[PDB]
Design a protein that fits this description.
The PDB classes it as metal binding protein. The entry lists the keywords four helical bundle, metal chaperone, metal binding protein. It is built from 4 helices and no strands. It is mainly alpha-helical. It has a single domain, classed as Four Helix Bundle (Hemerythrin (Met), subunit A), CATH 1.20.120.660.
Length: 83
Amino acid sequence: SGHTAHVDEAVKHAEEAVAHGKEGHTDQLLEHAKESLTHAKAASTHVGHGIKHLEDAIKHGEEGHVGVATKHAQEAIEHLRAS
Ligand code: NI
């Protein structure tokens, strides 16, 4: 897709990852963070910050720290929305 659609899908999935994370839905946050990341990579400086945070969100999620994965996914949205 073009840049716009990828950024949009990256934001939407990151929003859904955040929403899952606040509910403690670790695997669902992971599923969406990974979809967000695929789109953010396909959209590829705002985007690069978003990618870094999504990668961090996935690492922390895989580590059982869904609060920390959530915050990183929120940070990714801020950056992706910047872009
Ligand atoms: Ni594309």
